[PDB]
Design a binder for these strands. Structure first.
Length: 92
RNA sequence: CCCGAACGGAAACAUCUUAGUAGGGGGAGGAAAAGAAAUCAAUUGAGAUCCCCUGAGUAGGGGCGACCGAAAGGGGGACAGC
RNA sequence: GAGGUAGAGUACCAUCCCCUGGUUUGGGGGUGGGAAGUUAGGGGACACGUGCCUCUAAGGCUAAAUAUGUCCCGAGACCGAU
RNA sequence: CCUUUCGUCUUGAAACACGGGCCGGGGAGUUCACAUCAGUGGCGAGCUUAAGGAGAUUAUCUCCGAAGGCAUAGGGAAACCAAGUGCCCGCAGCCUAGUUUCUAGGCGAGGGGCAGGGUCUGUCAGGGCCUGAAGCCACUGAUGUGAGGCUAGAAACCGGGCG
RNA sequence: ACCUCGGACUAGGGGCAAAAGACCAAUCUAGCCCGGUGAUAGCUAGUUCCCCCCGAAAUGCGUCCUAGCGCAGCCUCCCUAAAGGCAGCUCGCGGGGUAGAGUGACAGAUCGGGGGCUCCAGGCGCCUGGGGCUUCCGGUCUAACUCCGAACCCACGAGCGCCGAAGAAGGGGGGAGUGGGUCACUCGGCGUAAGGUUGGGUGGCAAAAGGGGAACAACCCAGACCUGGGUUAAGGCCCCA
RNA sequence: UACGGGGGCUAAAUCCUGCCACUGGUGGUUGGUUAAAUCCGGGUUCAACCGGGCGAAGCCCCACCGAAGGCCGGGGGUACCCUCUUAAGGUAGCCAAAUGCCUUGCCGGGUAAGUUCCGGCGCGCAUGAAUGGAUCAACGCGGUCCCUACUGUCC
RNA sequence: CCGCAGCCUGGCGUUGUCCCUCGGGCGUUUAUGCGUAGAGUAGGUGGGAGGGGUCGAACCUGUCCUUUCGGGGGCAGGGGACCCGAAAGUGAAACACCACCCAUGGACGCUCGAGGGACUAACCUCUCGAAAGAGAGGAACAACGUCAGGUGGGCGGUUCGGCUGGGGCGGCACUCCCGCGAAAAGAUAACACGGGAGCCCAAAGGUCGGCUCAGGCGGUACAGAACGCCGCCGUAGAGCGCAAGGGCAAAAGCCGGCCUGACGUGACCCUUCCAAGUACGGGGUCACGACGCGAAAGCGGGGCCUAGCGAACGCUCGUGCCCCCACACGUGGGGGCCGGGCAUGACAGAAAAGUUACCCCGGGGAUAACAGGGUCGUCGCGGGCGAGAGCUCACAUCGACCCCGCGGUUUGCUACAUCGAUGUCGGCUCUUCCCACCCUGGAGGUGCAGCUGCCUCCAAGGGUAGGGCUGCCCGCCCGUUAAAGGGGAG
RNA sequence: UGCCCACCCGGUCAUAGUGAGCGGGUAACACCCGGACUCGUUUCGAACCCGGAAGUUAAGCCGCUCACGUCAGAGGGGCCGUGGGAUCCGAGAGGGCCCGCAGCCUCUCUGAGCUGGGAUGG
């Protein structure tokens, strides 16, 4: 697909339809020392089999594409619903 | 007091649990152990330890799965401290 | 009033391992470092700082209150010779 | 005169399926704890004493002992907030005169439907939950769950010894 | 590389094996005994007093699931609740594309003739044969065609009819088994077929004795409180009888 | 204490498993490099120090020598052609082998008949010379086939 | 799927002393600096108009080093005492003193490397020695401990999907969708049939406006059946993204204009999933708010409608706050919500390879193999009919294409019976049955001179061998005989 | 008066349609006049938009006739189902019969526009 860089949509803080910056969604860094991460080593310490099952088989060819819009007039950022696509082209 | 199991359970099973039990080794006594806080808790309080009833399946742990699982305080027993 | 004493590879720290709810927080050990020590230290749920509160280890030793039937008295909605 | 042999598995299969010589004796849904219900009783905005102590003809018994737990308010993670009333239909019973024999009408407990209120959430409608004042204890009972778990039945694996 | 005797040593996930997974005490794809341990069984067999009342399913969805379970439906028992409830029919009023029928009403399938137009081959401008196009006329089929279209089945209202305060629409609660069905008839599909399989509806049987069909789970008659009398059903009536 | 210690295939024995591309040497050269000694110039009041021409042998190069070391494939196509290692591409043998499908290749032996076996010829789908192919002396309670003698195995 | 031994490498400790070249440093020792304008070396910031001054300066004269030989910096004597300005320039001034930074070199005690070397006193190896102790070689290595990484079926535990007309192979009927199945309510099976999806579209989306298609006819240069143009007809025969079904004409089709509603938040409801429980997903109807389109009504939370998709846990993102302790407070760091993404196609979500013919266990006739029953595609046989050949003539005999029947001799399916056993091929012996008659008996026809033939019908009383090859059956063959029939009886 | 006759606004959505022929208009309705302004023609006043308005029943509109399409009625012909039941027939396929219902096609003939709300014309 093709999507323009700027889309006039509603801004919750601006309480009307405003211009926005549109870009793909990117996951953040794993951010070690998380509670869900801390227990991993505390569960991996000692002797035993691979404590947590890990996925090895993959079925879906692609992954869901998500749109991220930022509200220029108030620096707000909104999170949109995902969708399955080949590759979301950001060219206007 | 050291060493240290599998069986099963998770309807599979590997983390986990079954479990510091079964069992090994050492060493006593008629009881042993422990015993005088680097204890608690929290509006500035209590006052060794032990066991009994509660606190309580609460706190908290774990493919958050089966399950495991306190303490503090209160109530009893005798309450000895050098 | 003045002066003095008050326990080291011990606390504590990093790491690996063990276990217990102890979890970024517990205790033990191996390994490496490693203090202060009275004008000392520790502790008061992640770390650090600040104040406030309470204890003083790294040596002892200890009456009773409970664990049990190889045994001895007693009792029993325990059976009558497969 | 009419009549396939017991039990079980089983769509039927029982009669070519299994287990069945005879007799006698033995022999299999129990125990606890929790949860929940029923039935039963005691008390009641309380209930309930445990563990435990004292006295006693001594495990019986009597008194004492709320320790505690459940209910007595819910929402949400929290900071916190935090109700119990108001309409209507209407059973039994009662009252009214007829009782002609009675929904003829009222009163109407209970109950039902619209409400309302507290709470979080949503910017309002809303949405989720709670709220109309009764549970606790004791016995027996039943079922689920955990313990060998109705009875009996395996290859397995492990520890320690003995060849 | 003979054979054998007495002594001695090698221990089980080990020992030995001129090695067959052989032997190691009759126990060897991992020795024995005792203890974990009353291990694990979604499997297999048994499960014991009487009377009486009531009284099923073999289906759907999910499941490393089809030899079991969860949620349903189907049962029994209890309490509350207080006038309606509806397994049938009739009327009224709606829904339908199936049986059938049609193909010039689409989609396709498919047989022939006639007329005209066009091209080619042959023969003497003509004729014949063949090729393409059109028109007209005729016929043959459709689970995946429907211009039409029943019986029929279903919704709702009213009516009829039945049950109902002796024995009660709704609500709550305790306890289950049931998830392998089969056959007969009837309308399908698969397959020629099948006491085959797989669907819709009904009926038994399962759990239903009694009478007939010779005996018999299911075929017909017909639902066993008991004794007795009588009349009858499905069937039968020469003898067995 | 390596003619050893341990580990792996095998089972005795016998026989089959044209080329100078590189090096070495020899011979030579248009041509390039090449030490010591010597000449010239700068520079130094002379010496130390910088560049220019001559510079032997060896090396750079070519050809030959393989009873000099030694070497001597595969693929494409139809035993042969062709690029490269590096020059060519291993002759030869064996075979109805366990290899051959037409099958019982055909024929002969052996019997009345032989789907068994043996041997011979040659159509090699698809042998192509190494942990392979061929090979039987002696040996075997090994397996198959045939003959004699034998004989109640049979009729 | 993995885990643990062992092995290799490296780090740390047992780990000592001299060094040695270089590159790093540690705390020190010191000394070295011109874009232009200007008395002139302003390298860049500070306190600082005072700093030096028998608490020794200006002046010039040389020895000396260096440099962009610009020029400054260090030497005592000759000289016994003087210069910079708060004054002139510089986007930034004082060679007025003392500080910081960059930058060049050497050295001091310590550390690390590229490393290298040496020694012995650790320690190791061996010998002597009763002990004590001594001697010989390697060496701060090795070896051990510990940690990490690589390898690691040497050893240990495990799984080895599901559906299935036995199982495996086969395929996915295992996730969702169209029609048919399917029988005019709904629901309704098949490893039934014909098919699709794991997307694509910033425009293929919203709205407004305009035009009407496929196709055919007549006339015009190139001109053509079909490029364009002018007229006539054309009820969909086109087109609408992707399979099918349906729907659609001033449109949902085609062409332009403007847009981003393919909207945020909170809802109810349909299908999923009938009656009669339920995850997703899709879809519909809303309110609040703001948008966009059009004059407007109004229409727009995606595609004309029906397929285009993923729980817990954990991770990440956005969101405004909330919480972090047995004392409070501060900072950091964490935790929670609410929603989004990261996947599981075995698609209602374990992390998962083969053999066991050395197997073992509890079962299974809910189920394979031999053996009954049902059936008859095949097999054998029969009959109908009759193209054809036989000299003529279908039926003496052969009968093609077709059609209708029988048997349950093999062979195909069926799983009703048997899995706590109905012991499996052949053959031997022995008994019996049947007739679709091989011979023997009777009768007949004949393309029957006679024999030999060929064929039909009746007839099951009797007989129907012996050998070779092959285990058989089957099959080939030998020599006689009347021939050397075929089948049943678990 | 009137009512229907067209018109504007419709409902029914073909019995109301299509095609041809003819008839009707001095109002109504169109045809038709012209574009400077409004607006507008990826050329054009074609069309649309605006300003109009001579002529005119030829279009259209309207009525009528005839054809076809199409709804019904009747006739002829075509074709033929299904519920309910039986130890009825038939081996089966199938069929009859008693109890209840039908419809389908195709030719012939006969009809074939209805109606609400308002300003013109008779």
């Amino acid at each position: 697909m093709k999507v323009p860089k700027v889309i006039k949509t509603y801004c919750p803080k601006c309480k009307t339809h405003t211009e926005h910056s549109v870009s793909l969604y990117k996951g953040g860094k794993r951010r070690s020392l998380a509670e869900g991460q801390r227990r991993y080593e505390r569960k991996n310490v000692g002797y035993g089999s691979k404590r947590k099952p890990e996925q090895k088989r993959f079925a879906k060819t692609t992954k869901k594409q998500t749109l991220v819009l930022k509200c220029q007039k108030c620096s707000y950022t909104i999170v949109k619903e995902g969708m399955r696509l080949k590759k979301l082209e950001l060219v206007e």
